[PDB]
């Protein structure tokens, strides 16, 4: 590397960080924060987008003049992928979807597309590669979402050997579908939960921690070929977590039990709409899948990030669900000890 | 900066000719309209002593009856060679100030007519190249003019 784009400045908006990053799937929940932190330091962020340009406008104020470059691409058009990665030094793959469409399904977005990005990046000459997977990824799970990520996770590690795979748990934030999803059950009266929300342990992680971890992995060369797992600082029962969410939102809470087979059936009629499904058969599985406890995988603390307690920043997400402007404290959710 | 282009003072005359009727139509809609009067009469009354002590100037003084205009008391340019009247209010409220401005729009047409009829010939910027830049024709043939053009713009 005789060029080695050299950082300049104090790390501000007009500075140069030397990072030329292509961020696929930059138009979603996780992309907003990743692109924001890159442009907040002076990175050249290429944002290949499939949606309408009107939906990329929130990404324009995130960088200085000319530091955010927008391109068109198709997940099945390798030529378009190459155009957006050939001039870069790090590729970030944040592509995903909670549901399956006629054109695209879980295999296409979690296996066929991520592999193409890695294969094109490898020959294009990209030295770094960040791939996001799920904490509960295995090829022996009811969820087809989680089954596909395990299949697609290994292809990235076999197509781009040095890639850095990050396996976050459920992420919560302002635009998340995890804590907002819980608070939006109120449109149907009670809150269905397999069992009574018991027998499920989850370790939610803050969106910014996932973002800072992704950014740190783009800097320290002790993450090439590694595999991380971003998990929160506390483990909660699903029943406790949902009750806490409704406590912050300050709304009636009437949980009732529901059989697993019955939950899927209502989860199939809610995935008939041709728009954003309110819930799906796959989405119900992931809510109740206890988060793994992989202790052999390095986590956030190794990359220099300190996991953010949910109690610290749960009001931030659930404020808008409160029906009163001010509302005049909620006791912390019962957390499973470390033992 | 530059002299007036040929055929401008004719257009100003054509415009100034019809502008009195335009103000008349403005007064047909507001001066004697009872809704306008009730929203501007006895509103914002200022005394002549408070107006002076609060730093007011212009119509904010003349509205309250103070007879003061810097064009007639401290003239500049050629304002002492033109004829015009200074409208003065009596009540000191919004309505009287609205009348002064309307009358000032008339007295301004009065001054423009005199300016068009008394415009003298000659240069339009001081003939002193150490203050005002020389003409481009001189700047491209005279060494001194080019030196002063260079310095006055750097």
């Amino acid at each position: 590397l005789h060029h080695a784009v050299i950082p300049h400045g104090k790390g501000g908006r007009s500075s140069v960080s030397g990072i030329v990053a292509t961020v696929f799937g930059a138009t979603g929940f996780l992309g907003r924060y990743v692109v924001n932190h890159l442009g907040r330091m002076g990175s050249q962020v290429i944002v290949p987008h499939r949606c309408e340009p009107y939906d990329t406008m929130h990404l324009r104020p995130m960088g200085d003049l000319g530091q955010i470059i927008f391109m068109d691409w198709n997940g099945r058009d390798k030529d378009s992928i190459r155009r957006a990665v050939e001039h870069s030094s790090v590729v970030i793959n944040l592509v995903g979807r909670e549901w399956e469409t006629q054109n695209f399904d879980f295999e296409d977005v979690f296996v066929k597309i991520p592999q193409a990005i890695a294969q094109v990046s490898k020959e294009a000459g990209v030295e770094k590669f960040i791939h996001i997977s799920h904490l509960n990824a295995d090829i022996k799970s009811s969820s087809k979402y989680l089954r596909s990520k395990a299949v697609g996770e290994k292809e990235v590690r076999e197509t781009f050997p040095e890639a850095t795979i990050i396996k976050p748990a459920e992420i919560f934030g302002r635009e998340d579908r995890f804590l907002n999803y819980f608070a939006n059950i109120r449109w149907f009266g009670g809150v269905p939960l397999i069992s009574l929300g018991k027998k499920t342990v989850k370790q939610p992680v803050y969106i910014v921690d996932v973002t800072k971890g992704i950014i740190n992995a783009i800097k320290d060369p002790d993450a090439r070929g590694k595999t991380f797992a971003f998990v929160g600082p506390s483990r909660y029962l699903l029943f406790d977590l949902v009750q806490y969410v409704f406590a912050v939102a300050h709304r009636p809470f009437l949980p009732y039990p529901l059989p697993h087979f019955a939950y899927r059936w209502i989860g199939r009629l809610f995935e008939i709409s041709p728009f954003e499904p309110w819930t799906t058969r796959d989405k119900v599985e992931r809510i109740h899948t206890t988060d793994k406890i992989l202790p052999h995988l390095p986590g956030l603390e190794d990359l220099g990030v300190e996991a953010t307690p949910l109690e610290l920043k749960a009001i931030e997400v659930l404020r808008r669900h409160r029906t009163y402007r001010w509302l005049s404290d909620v006791q912390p959710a019962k957390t499973i000890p470390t033992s | 900066h530059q002299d007036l282009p040929l055929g401008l003072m004719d257009d100003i005359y054509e415009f100034s000719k019809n502008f009195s009727l335009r103000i008349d139509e403005l007064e047909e809609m507001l001066t004697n309209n009872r809704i306008w009067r009730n929203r501007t009469v006895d509103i914002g009354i200022v005394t002549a002593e408070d107006a002076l002590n609060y730093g007011f100037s212009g119509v904010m003084l003349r509205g309250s009856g103070i007879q003061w205009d810097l064009r007639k008391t401290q003239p500049y340019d050629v304002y002492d060679q033109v004829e015009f009247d200074v409208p003065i209010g009596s009540r000191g409220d919004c309505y009287d100030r609205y009348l002064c401005r309307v009358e000032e729009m008339r007295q301004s047409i009065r001054i423009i007519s005199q300016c068009l009829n008394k415009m003298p010939p000659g240069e339009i910027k001081v003939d002193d190249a150490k203050v005002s830049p020389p003409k481009r024709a001189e700047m491209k043939t005279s060494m001194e003019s080019l030196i002063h053009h260079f310095k006055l713009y750097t």
């Binding site: 950082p7 104090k10 790390g11 907040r40 330091m41 009001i315 931030e316 404020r319 | -």
Partner: protein, 116 residues
């Protein structure tokens, strides 16, 4: 003599520190409802830490005229917050949330830039 100077409010430090303490009291009692009225996302604990931290920085002062101005400015700052002239953005400009940490050790500065 030349050292003679016109006071602002307080003629000596002991009378100047009374104004400082009165100003810490009003600030200490305004954080609770400043975090409520503005709908901030910071606990009242770290709110009073920020008030405490600001005062401590101007603790080496030993000139009553300097201290009187620091008190005068502080009450101007307090009035803006009490009367909600400040927006949520102004109140959170003390905490520097979006400024990345800048390590102060020599080696860290050596790798990043030329600044001392």
């Amino acid at each position: 003599a030349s050292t003679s100077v016109k006071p602002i409010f307080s003629r000596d430090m002991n009378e100047a520190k009374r104004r400082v303490r009165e100003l810490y009291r009003a600030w200490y009692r305004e954080v609770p409802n400043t975090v409520h009225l503005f709908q901030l996302d910071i606990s009242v604990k770290q709110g009073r830490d920020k008030v405490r931290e600001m005062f401590k920085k101007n603790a080496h002062i030993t000139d009553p005229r300097v201290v009187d101005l620091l008190v005068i400015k502080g009450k101007m700052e307090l009035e803006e917050t009490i009367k909600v002239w400040k927006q949520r953005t102004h109140v959170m400009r003390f905490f520097h949330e979006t400024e990345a940490p800048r390590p102060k050790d020599f080696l860290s500065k050596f790798y990043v830039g030329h600044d001392p």
